[PDB]
Nucleic acid binder design. Structure first.
Ligand SMILES: Nc1nc2c(ncn2[C@H]2C[C@H](O)[C@@H](COP(=O)(O)OP(=O)(O)OP(=O)(O)O)O2)c(=O)[nH]1
Ligand SMILES: [Ca+2]
Ligand SMILES: [Mn+2]
Ligand SMILES: [Mn+2]
Length: 430
DNA sequence: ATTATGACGCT
DNA sequence: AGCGTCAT
C-alpha cells in the first residue's frame, strides 16, 4: 500500500551506440555508409570472424559470431572492414578512442558509468529536477521527443511506424500531470527530453548514432534501450512493467541469460519474467540464494537498486589472444615471443593511460588456456606490476606460468597453449 | 577454429 | 587470491 516502495526514486538512462565498430569504420570510410557491412577480425580462417553488423546487413541474417564466408552466402554484397592488426594480433585502439569521444560528451550532461566500450548508464535524477524547475510547469511538447517511443502505447482506441510512435507519444503526454514535480512519469519524460539532447550532441559532435532507454533503474533502462533500435530511444514507465513482463522471456533480462536464468525456468517451471511475482521473497531466496532471491523478487516488479557508479574509465587494461587448433604454442620460444607481443601492446596502452588519466596499475594478471580444457581460462596468476616495461612484464608472466609446462624437454611446451592473456589491474592515483 | 575484452560474484 | 559467470 502506502509504505510499499515502488522503485521510482531515480531516473536512469542507458545509452548504447548502434553497431558501434561498424559506425566507426563508416565514419572513416564513406564508401561503407548506408550499406550492408560488417567488421571482422582476421581473414585467413573462413574469411574472419564478424564482431559487428550494420542494420542493413542484419536484414539478410548476418550476425556477430558468424564467419565472413558464411555471411557472404547470406549477403553476397556485404562489405567488410577489418580490425587493425599490430604485433600479430587484433588491436582495438581505434574503437577505444572513439568510445572515449562519446563518453566525454555524455559526461557533460551527467555523471556516467561506463558499462562497455559502447554503452554507459546515466543517473539523470538531479538533471531532471533542475530541468523541471527551469520549466516552471509548462507541459512537454512532443517536438522535444522526436525519436522517443513510449513502451506499451498506443493502447485501445495507424499503418506506418512513425505514426504509431507519435500516437503512443500523444497518449502518454495527454495523460501527464505536469503540475506535480514529484510525479515519476513526468520525471521519466523530462529524462527522455534530456536524453534526446544528449543523443543529438553525440551525433552532431562524432557522427555516431545511438539508441537509449529511460526508466527508473539500470535493468529497465537497458531493456528499454533494446526495444526500438536503431537510432531511437524508449521510455519504460513503472506502470508499463506488468504487461511488458507478462510475455518477457526470463533470459532477456540482464544477468539472466545464462545458467541462473535457465535454473529459474527449470526449478520454477515458468517462462516469463512476470510469472516470478507469484513466489515469495523467501521462496526465491531458497532456490537462488539470498542475494539473487531478493533481486528477483524486486526485479519482477520493476524494482532494482544497483547504483549508477561514477566511473568513466575501465578498471582493467588487458591484452589477449587465442591460438586455436594447430596454431597453439608448443615451444618455449613461441610462448616467450607472444608474451612479449602482448606485453608490448599492454605497455603502450598503459603508458597512454597513465598520461591521460593520472593513474598507475599495480598488479599484473597472467591467464592461459591449455589444449583440451574447455574452460575459458585454465590458470590465472597475479604478480606485481612495478614498471611499465614490456620485457619485464613478459619475463614476469613467463615466470608465473612456467610451472605449467609439463614437458621434460626444456624447449618444448606441452600441453600446447591455446590462449594467452595479460591484464593490468589495481590502479592507484599518480 | 569464434575472438577480444571487461565487470562482478563466490569462497 | 584464484575461479566462475555473464556480457557479446
Ligand atoms: N572483439 C570483440 N568485440 C566485440 C564482441 N562483441 C561485440 N564486440 C564489439 C563490437 C560492437 O560494435 C561493440 C558494441 O557491442 P554491442 O553488443 O552493443 O553491439 P553493436 O553496438 O555492434 O550493435 P547494437 O546496435 O548495439 O545492437 O562491441 C566480441 O565478441 N569481440
Ligand atoms: Ca551497441
Ligand atoms: Mn553495447
Ligand atoms: Mn550487439
Amino acid at each position: 500500500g502506502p509504505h510499499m516502495a515502488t522503485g521510482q526514486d531515480r531516473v536512469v538512462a542507458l545509452v548504447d551506440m548502434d553497431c558501434f565498430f561498424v559506425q566507426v569504420e563508416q565514419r572513416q570510410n564513406p564508401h561503407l555508409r548506408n550499406k550492408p557491412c560488417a567488421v571482422v577480425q582476421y581473414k585467413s580462417w573462413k574469411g574472419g570472424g564478424i564482431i559487428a553488423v550494420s542494420y542493413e546487413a542484419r536484414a539478410f541474417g548476418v550476425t556477430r559470431s558468424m564467419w565472413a564466408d558464411d555471411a557472404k552466402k547470406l549477403c553476397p554484397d556485404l562489405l567488410l572492414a577489418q580490425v587493425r592488426e599490430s604485433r600479430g594480433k587484433a588491436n582495438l585502439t581505434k574503437y577505444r578512442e572513439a568510445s572515449v569521444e562519446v563518453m566525454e560528451i555524455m559526461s557533460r550532461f551527467a555523471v556516467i558509468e561506463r558499462a562497455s566500450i559502447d554503452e554507459a548508464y546515466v543517473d539523470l535524477t538531479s538533471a531532471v529536477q533542475e530541468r523541471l524547475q527551469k520549466l516552471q510547469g509548462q507541459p512537454i511538447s512532443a517536438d522535444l521527443l522526436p525519436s522517443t517511443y513510449i513502451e506499451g502505447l498506443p493502447q485501445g482506441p495507424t499503418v506506418q511506424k512513425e505514426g504509431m510512435r507519435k500516437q503512443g507519444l500523444f497518449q502518454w503526454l495527454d495523460s501527464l500531470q505536469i503540475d506535480n514535480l514529484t510525479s515519476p512519469d513526468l520525471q521519466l519524460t523530462v529524462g527522455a527530453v534530456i536524453v534526446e539532447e544528449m543523443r543529438a550532441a553525440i551525433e552532431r559532435e562524432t557522427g555516431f548514432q545511438c539508441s537509449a532507454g529511460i526508466s527508473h533503474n539500470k535493468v529497465l533502462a537497458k531493456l528499454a534501450c533494446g526495444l526500438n533500435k536503431p537510432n531511437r530511444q524508449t521510455l519504460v514507465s513503472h506502470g508499463s512493467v506488468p504487461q511488458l513482463f507478462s510475455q518477457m522471456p526470463i533470459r532477456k533480462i540482464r544477468s539472466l541469460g545464462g545458467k541462473l536464468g535457465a535454473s529459474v525456468i527449470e526449478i520454477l517451471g515458468i517462462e516469463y519474467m512476470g510469472e516470478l511475482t507469484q513466489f515469495t521473497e523467501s521462496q526465491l531466496q531458497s532456490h537462488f540464494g539470498e542475494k539473487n532471491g531478493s533481486w528477483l523478487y524486486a526485479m519482477c516488479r520493476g524494482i532494482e537498486h544497483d547504483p549508477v557508479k561514477p566511473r568513466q574509465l575501465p578498471k582493467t587494461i588487458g591484452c589477449s589472444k587465442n591460438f586455436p587448433g594447430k596454431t597453439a604454442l608448443a615451444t618455449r620460444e613461441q610462448v616467450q615471443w607472444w608474451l612479449l607481443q602482448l606485453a608490448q601492446e599492454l605497455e603502450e596502452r598503459l603508458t597512454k593511460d597513465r598520461n591521460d588519466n593520472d593513474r598507475v596499475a599495480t598488479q599484473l594478471v597472467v591467464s592461459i588456456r591449455v589444449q583440451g580444457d574447455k574452460r575459458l581460462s585454465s590458470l590465472r596468476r597475479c604478480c606485481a606490476l612495478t614498471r611499465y616495461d614490456a620485457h619485464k612484464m613478459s619475463h614476469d608472466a613467463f615466470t608465473v606460468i612456467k610451472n605449467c609446462n609439463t614437458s621434460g624437454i626444456q624447449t618444448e611446451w606441452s600441453p600446447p597453449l591455446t590462449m594467452l592473456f595479460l591484464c593490468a589491474t589495481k590502479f592507484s592515483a599518480s
